[PDB]
């Protein structure tokens, strides 16, 4: 029954509308839900705007009037120019009159702010259409009318604020370059009278609401107005004194002064420098006397969260960091400004103690700026010695686990601070360590934080000073661990001990007996059942190895053999209690060390010995499972095989090219294993259906295949002997994977096959032209059919497919020249299919392939294939690119859409296409490609955007073709087009902007 308002044959029941509206805002359940769909359809009715004036006049529901203004807004925004002229002046007079009526009635001006703000915004949308060319007295009459009442003067500040935002802050995408410039120039011409009205209100009081609304509009002006209005008036004195005292105006005034700390000023004038000093001095004075003194505990204040204290402290941090990052040099030389400089930094110190992640990052960014300058700029660090001493403690106590980005910022600041005063940093850290020992500050979180801070300054002290520091730290940490009771406490401290020693490789490298003791200790921890310890021991082991590998490969003094031989020898007992992932990390670490041995025979011997246990287990299964293939369904057998291949992956990851001897030991049997597993998966799908691909048994089998491919990928991506890859590796690999991929049902095809082929083509693609052809033959058409029905199925295959086509188009373009014409047509379809994806991985690759394909065709010259390519697919690529550019569903690819389009258009206007792009009956003979290109595009846009005039399409195409060598201007013309198609009656002269 509520669907009574959607019938516009009758007259609108205003009382019924007010009930439907309140049912949607105050109701619930199904009543609210279908009242929602009714209000949407009422609003989306193209004629509803005609019924907006009786709603705004007769309705008793402010929400109904809000919705009526929304319907008006859509009309003013999209169809204003299509209206008869008398309607435009009627709407304009109606809105002006209603706003005046709402400001006179004090109970509606006070209790209906949403409606007035929405009305002010609707008025601003009209000014964007009519002002100033058909409304040149708006600003003089706004100022005159402001002197009448206080409610109008305050409301005029709201209109001006919203006007400033629409013209300067949000115009860049919402309107054309020409229309934006027109509006900016109009406000700029008449701002002299706007600033006079604003300044008079701020100086004469007295209504707080009128003052705040005036300050809010001043905030917006500061984004663009010339500097003279700020420094050559008294307004800086008003902001930094009067308006800082009252809490009603404090928040907005602080934001205005923050923007002032960013204005474009002359760095030559000595008074502008004095005025920049003066308002900062006044602001800090008002804060110390009216808000809180410099000794106040801002951390507690922020945590109590009274009133707007949190937002004020956030705005104070923004103000101080912004001003001091730009102007602190103004305060560093004059001795009378020293206390002002240090109190301000002391407020930041107090602000930096607040428990608020995002606020801390804001202050940390400033500290980084400061301590970097004190590190490089002469005669500066001595000013801030007490500030920097406090900062050291703040950062040490707030050290985070090594957010990724936040730790790097803290480390860099702390490292700068250590350079500035090593001695002060040492005593603070040892003091904090002493307070961990006596128990006054003992905590798992506190001991970990301190250890991270100690480990972060590695490499900033002299090696000799570092030596005594490390020894003192490790000794005190060992005493801490010795004194605590329980494995929980001892594991935390032992973990911190290993973290610290892991962070000081210069110390470990100079003391082999200590380094050996560390490693032997980590091997003991690899048998610890307590959670986390085994993971920590393994992570520390590979971390230390990465930095001290040379000391494991050589024979240390008074040692009988390089320690790497001692590690490999006991590898079974060392790793016996580790989980498989931890064993793989161990083997990877050993591989790092072996690669340091540059004697080939000695490196291959260490590789053979390291791989001995997995090679023995491999030879067992290869003999056992090949005779006969039933064990490959045994759970335990599949797990052993996968863990053997993963061990090879881990070692190949750290050894790269040096891994080739071990790969040759298993390569042929591994590929045979790949075939056998592939048979069993296909057999299991046949016997049980597609659901078999989800069973544990098959997923274990696919893991084997994936790990095999990952191992091959890992070596080939890092190989140095590319010849051996081509003659030994590539051919048996293609025979093993391509046909199995092609002849499997879609649900059984491993997308990792495509990724592996991408790696092969990446490194040796220029050497295997026939191999690249066989890769396309086996995967191209069958994969395309999996992914060309929708945008959702087979997401992995989708991404790998276009990565593979991308590298083939780059490294072996001749493979596409060998495709039959029907297959090459599917190639073009698949490229355009990638345009239409919202998936960024597919979309970006698809546009890059199109751009690279055009360049591949261009470099062929005037030959039958290039000529035919243009006659067949040039306009396809032009029209498909225009489609994704203008459909509003692929905005993330605008930049690469523009460049591709610019490349296509520039080809025609550079006469790089020999053949005529038309058939010689379409158009009279002798017609240039440029003339036909404009005629094709004009017809295409006329049918795709019928609401455009012919003059708009012509002006747009004229500008676009002329600008196909200037990407920045070209893109501005596309953005202008994207604005004009959202509306009716766009000015065709807008395309003459450049």
């Amino acid at each position: 029954s509520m669907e009574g308002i959607l019938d516009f044959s009758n007259d609108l029941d205003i009382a019924l509308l007010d009930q439907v509206v309140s049912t949607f805002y105050q109701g619930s359940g199904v009543q609210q839900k279908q009242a929602q769909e009714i209000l949407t359809k009422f609003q989306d009715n193209p004629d509803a705007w005609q019924k907006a004036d009786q709603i705004l006049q007769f309705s008793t529901n402010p929400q109904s009037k809000f919705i009526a203004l929304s319907i008006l807004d859509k009309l003013i925004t999209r169809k204003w120019k299509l209206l008869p002229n008398d309607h435009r002046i009627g709407i304009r007079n109606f809105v002006v009159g209603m706003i005046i009526s709402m400001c006179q009635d004090d109970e509606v001006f006070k209790t209906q702010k949403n409606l007035i703000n929405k009305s002010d915004l609707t008025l601003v949308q009209i000014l964007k259409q009519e002002w100033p060319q058909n409304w040149p007295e708006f600003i003089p009459e706004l100022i005159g009318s402001s002197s009448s009442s206080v409610n109008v003067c305050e409301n005029n500040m709201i209109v001006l604020k919203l006007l400033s935002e629409e013209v300067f802050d949000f115009s860049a995408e919402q309107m054309t370059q020409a229309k934006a410039l027109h509006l900016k120039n109009s406000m700029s011409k008449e701002f002299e009278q706007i600033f006079k009205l604003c300044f008079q209100v701020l100086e004469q009081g007295s209504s707080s609401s009128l003052i705040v609304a005036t300050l809010e509009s001043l905030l917006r002006y500061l984004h663009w107005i010339p500097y003279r209005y700020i420094y050559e008036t008294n307004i800086l004195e008003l902001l930094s004194t009067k308006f800082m005292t009252s809490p009603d105006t404090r928040a907005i005034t602080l934001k205005c002064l923050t923007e002032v700390s960013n204005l474009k000023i002359p760095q030559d004038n000595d008074l502008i420098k004095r005025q920049t000093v003066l308002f900062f001095q006044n602001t800090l004075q008002q804060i110390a006397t009216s808000v809180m003194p410099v000794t106040a505990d801002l951390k507690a204040t922020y945590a109590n969260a009274n009133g707007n204290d949190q937002s004020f402290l956030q705005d104070l941090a923004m103000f101080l960091t912004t001003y001091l990052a730009r102007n602190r040099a103004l305060l560093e030389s004059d001795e009378s400004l020293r206390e002002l400089l240090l109190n301000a930094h002391q407020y930041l110190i107090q602000l930096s103690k607040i428990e608020e992640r995002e606020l801390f990052k804001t202050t940390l960014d400033y500290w980084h700026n400061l301590v970097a300058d004190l590190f490089y700029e002469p005669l500066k660090k001595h000013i801030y010695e007490e500030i920097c001493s406090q900062l050291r403690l703040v950062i040490i106590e707030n050290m985070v686990r090594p957010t990724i980005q936040l730790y790097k910022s803290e480390r860099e600041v702390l490292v700068y601070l250590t350079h500035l005063n090593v001695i002060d940093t040492e005593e603070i850290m040892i003091s904090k360590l002493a307070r961990q020992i006596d128990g006054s500050e003992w905590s798992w979180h506190n001991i970990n934080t301190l250890s991270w801070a100690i480990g972060s300054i590695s490499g900033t002290m002299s090696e000799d000073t570092e030596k005594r520091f490390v020894v003192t730290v490790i000794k005190d940490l060992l005493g801490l661990c010795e004194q605590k009771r329980g494995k929980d406490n001892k594991a935390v401290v032992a973990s911190d001990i290993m973290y610290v020693v892991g962070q000081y490789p210069r110390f470990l490298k100079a003391h082999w007996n200590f380094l050996r003791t560390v490693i032997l200790k980590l091997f003991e921890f690899m048998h610890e059942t307590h959670e986390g310890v085994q993971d920590m021991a393994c992570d520390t082991f590979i971390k230390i190895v990465q930095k001290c590998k040379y000391h494991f490969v050589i024979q240390q003094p008074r040692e009988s053999e390089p320690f790497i031989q001692t590690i490999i020898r006991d590898i079974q007992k060392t790793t016996a209690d580790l989980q498989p992932q931890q064993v793989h990390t161990f083997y990877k670490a050993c591989g790092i060390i072996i690669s340091e041995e540059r004697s080939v025979a000695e490196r291959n011997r260490l590789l053979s010995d390291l791989m001995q246990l997995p090679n023995m287990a491999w030879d067992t299964i290869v003999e056992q499972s090949t005779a006969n293939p039933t064990l490959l369904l045994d759970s335990e057998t599949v797990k052993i095989i996968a863990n053997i291949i993963k061990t090879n992956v881990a070692v190949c990851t750290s050894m790269g090219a040096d891994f080739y001897p071990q790969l040759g030991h298993i390569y042929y049997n591994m590929l045979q294993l790949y075939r056998a597993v592939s048979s069993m998966i296909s057999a299991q799908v046949a016997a049980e259906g597609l659901i078999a691909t989800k069973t544990p048994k098959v997923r274990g089998l696919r893991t084997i295949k994936k790990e095999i491919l990952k191992l091959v990928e890992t070596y080939i991506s890092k190989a140095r002997n590319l010849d051996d890859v081509v003659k030994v590796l590539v051919e048996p690999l293609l025979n093993a994977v391509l046909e199995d991929y092609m002849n499997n049902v879609p649900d059984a095809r491993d997308a990792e096959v495509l990724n592996c082929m991408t790696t092969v083509v990446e490194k040796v693609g220029h050497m295997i032209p026939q191999g690249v052809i066989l890769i396309l033959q086996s995967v191209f058409e069958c994969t395309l059919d999996m992914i060309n029905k929708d945008f959702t199925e087979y997401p992995e295959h989708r991404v790998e497919f276009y990565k593979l086509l991308k590298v083939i188009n780059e490294k072996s373009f001749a493979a596409f020249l060998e495709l039959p014409p029907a297959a090459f047509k599917l190639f073009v379809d698949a490229i355009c299919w990638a345009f239409k994806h919202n998936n960024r991985d597919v979309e970006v690759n698809g546009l890059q392939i199109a751009l690279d394909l055009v360049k591949n065709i261009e470099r062929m010259g005037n030959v039958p294939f290039a000529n035919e390519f243009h006659k067949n697919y040039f306009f396809i690529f032009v029209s498909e690119t225009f489609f994704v550019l203008t459909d509003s569903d692929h905005k993330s690819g605008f930049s690469k859409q523009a460049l591709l389009l610019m490349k296509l258009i520039s080809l025609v206007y550079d006469n790089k296409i020999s053949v005529p792009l038309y058939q010689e009956a379409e158009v009279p003979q002798g017609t240039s490609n440029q003339v036909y290109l404009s005629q094709y595009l004009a017809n295409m846009l006329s049918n795709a955007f019928p609401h455009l005039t012919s003059e708009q399409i012509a002006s747009f195409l004229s500008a676009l073709t002329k600008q196909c060598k200037d990407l920045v201007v070209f893109k501005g013309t596309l953005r202008d087009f994207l604005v004009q198609i959202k509306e009716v009656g766009g000015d065709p002269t807008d395309y003459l902007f450049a």
């Binding site: 060992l478 001990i497 560390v518 200790k521």
Partner: peptide, 17 residues
């Protein structure tokens, strides 16, 4: 002795009781 005692003290690092 200072770095020798450190090495011995770490050698005795044990997690149990």
């Amino acid at each position: 002795t200072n770095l020798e005692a450190l090495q011995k003290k770490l050698e005795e690092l044990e997690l149990d009781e």
